[PDB]
């Protein structure tokens, strides 16, 4: 077979050309450009609220855009909308499949999604004329587990999956309008851009791919990790993103440079990152770990600012609110803690 | 405390109702036995779920035997890698592992140089020595038993195991497959492997599952009391 081998020779030529082009763009590291910048001090965040009521391991949380309600999914088959200011529970949504791996609050707040090992993104109408939360749609086109779902609108939702694909859905139609078919490992994380036109998706092939929601294409590809990318989060600019992997390093990539800018690693950390978020300015990089605690990274100097240590098991989910006020941090010890 | 509003009080009361329902659901799910049903592609898991309980995703099979509710989660339809979702079943009571032991000579459909029993052995090695099932006991099933005792009259076990020094009778080869599967245990002091042969039995496989699950529940009761 000459044609497939000469075209993979062309592919290796393209990889060498892209590598040397983004090496020609690499002149000065971000850690040496922000060396003049006064570092943030010892970040001391206390557990302000602790959210009790999940019986099994919490696998995902998602903040509402009102920065007060958050949904959390745990594998006792329960989707709980929490009120964070009052600690009390707004809804408990029993799930048709107990094996939920992801949850997403709609930015309107009218809907919430969940999904996992049933390969179905169930979408739950929070605001019904009845007082129950009912399923508004069940998105049943993925063949692997759903690892991340993310609401774009009330009617659009992009879902990561373990079938090496992401998929943009239409909720009133129930079918995937777009499929993102570029990854070769299980896609484990999503992060929508703030303008919601792009999203990055990290996968188990150690690569993050930047997609275009409208065009349906893989815009850029980001290979900087050694192990499976479990977590991804856009910078609040929308022009950068951080990836959390099982390599125990967080790497911040840039969309405009198409390369890794930083490596948020520590030699005393051997266990992978499950969750990555940013603060409201992107100065802080909240990263959840399997060593039972979140770590607060200076996202411009790669120096670990603080440690959110309150969890008796692996930190599995964390989100910073849209006003940057709090960091919820859910974990496998069946509690979410609100940090500030 | 009277620092709350009239609607804050009723929201707190709604949350305590939600708490009551959550506690009752957690207590209901605590009585149920979760079983992670595993095995190879042609290992006879569906025979097990149709003689024990009498699209995409994972399949749960609820059944009741001697006033225990069991829940058997078949994960055979997850072509994705097990590393990213096998921790979901950390805390499962036992692992039903079905092995078609008549597939000692047969090879796979995706790779025809590896035989199916050695693939089941590598899957059993990955599952048993996993970091999530260090104390989760394995109820191992050697399923197609009469087909095995016919096929060893038609084809020896040296096709599968070259280091085998026994003959082609049923009890020798069956005890050899059972010990070669139980030697894949690298814990051996934290988790127990329960082994059975399930060819044509009437309500005996679910009795074996109930007895092995009862031993697991006794050991977890003793660990809940520190003993």
């Amino acid at each position: 077979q000459s044609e497939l081998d000469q075209l993979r020779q062309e592919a290796e030529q393209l990889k060498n050309q892209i590598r040397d082009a983004r090496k020609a763009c690499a002149d000065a590291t971000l850690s040496q450009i922000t060396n003049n910048i006064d570092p943030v001090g010892r970040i001391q965040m206390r557990t302000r609220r602790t959210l009790r009521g999940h019986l099994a391991k919490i696998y995902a949380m998602h903040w509402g855009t009102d920065s007060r309600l958050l949904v959390s999914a745990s594998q006792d088959g329960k989707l709980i909308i929490w009120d964070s200011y009052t600690t009390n529970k707004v809804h408990a949504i029993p799930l048709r499949s107990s094996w939920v791996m992801t949850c997403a609050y709609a930015p309107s707040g009218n809907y919430v999604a969940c999904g996992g090992l049933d390969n179905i993104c169930s979408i739950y109408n929070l605001k019904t004329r009845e007082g129950n939360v009912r399923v508004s749609r069940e998105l049943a086109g993925h063949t692997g587990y759903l690892s991340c779902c993310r609401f774009l609108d009330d009617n659009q939702i992009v879902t990561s999956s373990g079938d090496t694909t992401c998929a943009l859905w239409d909720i009133e139609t129930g079918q995937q309008t777009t499929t993102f078919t570029g990854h070769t490992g299980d896609v484990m994380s999503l992060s929508l851009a703030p303008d919601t036109r792009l999203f990055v998706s990290g996968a188990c092939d150690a690569s993050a791919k930047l997609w275009d929601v409208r065009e349906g294409m893989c815009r850029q590809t980001f290979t900087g990790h050694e192990s499976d990318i479990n977590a991804i989060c856009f910078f609040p600019n929308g022009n950068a993103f951080a990836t959390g992997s099982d390599d125990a390093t967080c790497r911040l990539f840039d969309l405009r440079a198409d390369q890794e800018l930083m490596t948020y690693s520590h030699d005393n950390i051997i266990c992978g990152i499950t969750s990555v978020s940013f603060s409201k300015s992107g100065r802080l990089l909240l990263a959840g770990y399997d060593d039972f605690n979140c770590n607060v990274w200076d996202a411009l100097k790669a120096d670990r600012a603080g440690v959110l240590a309150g969890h008796d098991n692996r930190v599995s989910c964390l989100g910073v609110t849209d006003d940057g006020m709090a960091v919820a941090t859910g974990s496998w010890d069946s509690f979410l803690k609100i940090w500030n | 405390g009277c620092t709350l509003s009239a609607e804050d009080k009723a929201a707190v009361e709604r949350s305590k109702m939600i708490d009551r329902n959550l506690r009752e659901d957690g207590e209901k799910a605590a009585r149920e036995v979760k079983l992670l049903l595993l095995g190879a592609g042609e290992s006879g898991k569906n025979t097990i779920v149709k003689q024990m309980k009498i699209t995409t995703g994972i399949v749960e099979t609820h059944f009741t035997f001697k006033d225990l509710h069991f829940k058997m989660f078949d994960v055979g339809a997850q072509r994705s890698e097990r590393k990213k979702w096998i921790h979901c079943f950390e805390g499962v009571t036992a692992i039903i592992f079905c092995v078609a032991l008549s597939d000692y000579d047969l090879v796979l459909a995706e790779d025809e140089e590896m035989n199916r029993m050695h693939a089941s052995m590598k899957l059993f090695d990955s599952i048993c020595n996993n970091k999530w099932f260090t104390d989760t006991s394995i109820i191992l099933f050697l399923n197609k038993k009469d087909l095995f005792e016919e096929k060893i009259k038609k084809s020896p076990l040296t096709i599968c195991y070259p280091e085998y020094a026994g003959s082609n009778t049923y009890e020798e080869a069956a005890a050899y497959i059972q010990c070669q599967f139980e030697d894949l245990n690298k814990r051996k002091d934290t988790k127990e492997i329960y082994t059975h042969f399930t060819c044509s039995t009437d309500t005996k496989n679910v009795q074996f599952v109930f007895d092995a699950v009862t031993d697991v529940i006794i050991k977890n009761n003793l660990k809940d009391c520190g003993l």
Partner: single-chain antibody, 232 residues
Framework: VQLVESGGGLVQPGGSRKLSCSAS????????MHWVRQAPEKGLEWVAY????????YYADTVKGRFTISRDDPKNTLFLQMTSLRSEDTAMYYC??????????????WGQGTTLTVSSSDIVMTQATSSVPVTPGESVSISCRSS???????????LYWFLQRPGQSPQLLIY???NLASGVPDRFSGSGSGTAFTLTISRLEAEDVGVYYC?????????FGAGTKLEL
């Protein structure tokens, strides 16, 4: 969603009457249910309240002791046992759906109540106006004054605006002083600070006329305002 109250009719005084409300079309066990009176050609008046799961029962001090409110969450039925029926208890008794979580709209569905006829501290909500004639298209500002700051410490102001059209049960317009209810068109708006409140209707129509009640939900009993009637 339907709340169909049952019972009522002529009741001679001193006798009991059980007012049933068969609920239908919603998750009845999740809703805290109210009973709200409306004496003939008078304003709304809250009678009783039972919580979701019957854990908290409040009554008006007019009916505290004589009336008992109860639920049957399997049958989806609300009761009001009215012992020792005085002659000021003649009214139309509406049964009100209400749910309380963060961002909920309580008092949002009212039943078409039963007319019960009998033979013979509290936050005072003062709507100083009582009848405003407006043509369709005028921008009305119905006001309401509270005898206590309805602004609670947490940030929201528990003021509830209702519209009782003639021959109709009351309908929630504005919940918690600024938030429009679910079926309510973006022509009603609420504003105010603590005690002085206003509901600004813009581009009024023929169905927007009717009686307009403000109601506090800061403190039990839930006192209504005397309604501002709108005509053409």
């Amino acid at each position: 969603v339907q709340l169909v109250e049952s019972g009522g009719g002529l009741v001679q005084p001193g006798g009991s009457r059980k007012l049933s409300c068969s609920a239908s079309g919603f998750a009845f066990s999740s809703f805290g249910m109210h009973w709200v009176r409306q004496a003939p050609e008078k304003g709304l008046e809250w009678v009783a309240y039972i919580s979701s799961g019957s854990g908290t029962i409040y009554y008006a001090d007019t009916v505290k002791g004589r009336f008992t409110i109860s639920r049957d969450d399997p049958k989806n039925t609300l009761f009001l046992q009215m012992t020792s029926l005085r002659s000021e208890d003649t009214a139309m008794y509406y049964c009100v759906r209400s749910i309380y979580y963060y961002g909920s709209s309580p008092f949002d569905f009212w039943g078409q109540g039963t007319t019960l006829t009998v033979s013979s501290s509290d936050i005072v909500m003062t709507q100083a106006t009582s009848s405003v004639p407006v043509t369709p298209g005028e921008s009305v500002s119905i006001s309401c004054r509270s005898s206590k700051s309805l602004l609670h410490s947490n940030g929201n102001t528990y003021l509830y605006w209702f519209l009782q059209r003639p021959g109709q049960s009351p309908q929630l317009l504005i919940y918690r002083m600024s938030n429009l209810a679910s079926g309510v068109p973006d022509r009603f708006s609420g504003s105010g600070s603590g005690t002085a409140f206003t509901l600004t209707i813009s581009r009024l129509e023929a169905e927007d006329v009717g009686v307009y009640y403000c109601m506090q939900h800061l403190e039990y009993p839930l006192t209504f305002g005397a309604g501002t009637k709108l005509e053409l």
